[PDB]
């Protein structure tokens, strides 16, 4: 019933920041953040699976990438049955979609030789199935790509904090950048969900600050949503 | 609409063997085998995740145990919508249930220090969730425990073949045996599904051959089912 918009971007590009600005511009506009919280502390002071992947990827890239996508579905599906469900002109913004999970990060980790054939086969198999049961209602109506040079992102990773991502090199962000570009800009990166084929994509340059110029961006978004 | 019966046993105890005897005793009696096929070949030529777990458990016990339970649900759920669905007095026999997956094998692998805290937490968390969505229709109506000394099993593991299980020692089978005993016989092994509490359990000694004495056993089963 609700219009579902996904906010794609690189690491520390600024989805959270950008969405919070939209969040407070309507009571019929909710958000569904990546559960990065539970990734740094597993539960049911446990363990930090995010950090484990970073410290030794060739070992935890699979474990993580799986838990990560599961955790996201659980979260998106929930906010889907929330109070918002009964409003008039509702819109739900997702911080990333299960698509970038698999086609951007997971994929890139496999190409970076952190997941062997067997692991990467299982992952796709698992993912393919999961998004055929529940995923039937998480289909997107639109996508907003916050474009930003990997250098700008590497900077915002520092400005942010998280003592896990501090070891991340430009190379990694760069590889992840091209992945985004290929998928949302040049639209050459092929999926496995033939519907993304006809899905609208607003791209915004977010290399310059937000808390200031954020006026212009919003205008373009209101515009975009008005055509769905 | 179908009565679901689970056939629990140790490794190579003889479920497959025993069920095939029942399978051919009614057209309203189908079977759902462990997809051990796809576990030895993930591509469907590819990698053998079963063997990987055996060669280096402290590394693949998690990956395997997860795929294994997923694969089972996918299979049980399917046969659940098969032609059998519209018969008169239908019965579907499961080779193992997701319960022994988690409380017998996975559990025991964690206690054997092959899954660290973080892995075992995620597994339970994952499993707890999975069996709350679909699992709602895979609830058992009865269970049949094929009891057999671990030694007898170790023997049948040899008689069978599988060049993966040939490295298995008695200790392993023994540990797995007590697990079974504690859960289905002494019923002291506590779960997390408060309904198994009131579920019927027929135990049969299968230490002596089947292709012969298999008459007696069947009698006791027809008997058991008649009271459900
Ligand atoms: O114009 C901007 C936009 C964002 N940020 C920084 O971006 C960080 C947040 O990055 P974010 O968490 O939003 O990346 P995301 O989680 O949205 O993907 C904040 O600490 C801000 O300091 C900034 O400095 N200037
Ligand atoms: O009375 C019997 C029943 C079974 N088997 C052996 O049990 C093996 C099969 O073990 P099974 O695969 O049935 O264990 P399961 O897969 O049912 O758990 C076969 O090769 C048989 O040779 C046997 O020797 N005598
Ligand atoms: N599918 C995903 C999602 C997140 N992350 C990790 C990578 C970064 O360390 C952090 C990024 O969080 P965010 O995307 O909000 O910047 O989480 C990941 O590896 N794979
Ligand atoms: N939950 C499960 C099911 C099977 N197996 C593995 C262990 C044995 O090598 C083989 C046993 O198959 P079966 O139980 O049909 O004898 O598969 C396992 O480790 N855990
Ligand atoms: Mg965030
Ligand atoms: Mg078998």
Curated annotation (Swiss-Prot), chains A, B:
Effect seen on changing residue 101 to A: Strongly increased catalytic efficiency towards deoxycytidine. Strongly increased catalytic efficiency towards deoxythymidine
UniProt-annotated binding residues for substrate: 34, 54, 65, 96, 101, 165
Record's GO cellular component terms: cytoplasm; cytosol; mitochondrion; nucleoplasm
Keyword Nucleotide-binding: yes
One of the GO biological process terms: nucleoside phosphate biosynthetic process
Molecular function as annotated in GO: ATP binding; cytidine kinase activity; deoxyadenosine kinase activity; deoxycytidine kinase activity; deoxyguanosine kinase activity; protein homodimerization activity
Keywords annotated in UniProt: ATP-binding, Kinase, Nucleotide-binding, Nucleus, Phosphoprotein, Transferase
Enzyme Commission identifier(s): 2.7.1.74, 2.7.1.76, 2.7.1.113
Signal peptide: none
Subcellular location(s) per record: Nucleus
Family the UniProt entry places it in: Belongs to the DCK/DGK family.
Complex and partners: Homodimer.
Job description of the protein: Phosphorylates the deoxyribonucleosides deoxycytidine, deoxyguanosine and deoxyadenosine. Has broad substrate specificity, and does not display selectivity based on the chirality of the substrate. It is also an essential enzyme for the phosphorylation of numerous nucleoside analogs widely employed as antiviral and chemotherapeutic agents.
PANTHER family assigned: DEOXYCYTIDINE KINASE (PTHR10513:SF19), DEOXYNUCLEOSIDE KINASE (PTHR10513)
Protein name: Deoxycytidine kinase
The encoding gene: DCK
């Amino acid at each position: 019933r609700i219009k579902k918009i996904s906010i794609e971007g690189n690491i520390a590009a600024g989805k959270s920041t950008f969405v919070n600005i939209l969040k407070q511009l309507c009571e019929d506009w909710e958000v569904v953040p990546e559960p990065v919280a539970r990734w740094c502390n597993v539960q049911s002071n446990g363990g930090n699976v995010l950090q484990m992947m970073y410290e030794k990827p060739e070992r935890w890239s699979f474990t993580f990438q799986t838990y990560a996508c599961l955790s996201r579905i659980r979260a998106q599906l929930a906010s889907l049955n929330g109070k918002l469900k009964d409003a008039e002109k509702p819109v739900l913004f997702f911080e990333r979609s299960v698509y970038s999970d698999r086609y951007i990060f997971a994929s890139n980790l496999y190409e970076s030789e952190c997941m062997n054939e067997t692991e990467w086969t299982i992952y796709q198999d698992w993912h393919d199935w999961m998004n055929n049961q529940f995923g039937q209602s998480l289909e997107l109506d639109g996508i907003i790509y916050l474009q930003a040079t990997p250098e700008t992102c590497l900077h915002r990773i520092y400005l942010r904090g998280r003592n896990e991502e501090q070891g991340i090199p430009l190379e990694y962000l760069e590889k992840l950048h091209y992945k985004h570009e290929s998928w949302l800009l040049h639209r050459t990166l092929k999926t496995n969900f033939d519907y993304l084929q006809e899905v609208p994509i607003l791209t915004l340059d977010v290399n310059e600050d937000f808390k200031d110029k954020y006026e212009s961006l919003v205008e373009k978004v209101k515009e975009f949503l008005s055509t769905l």
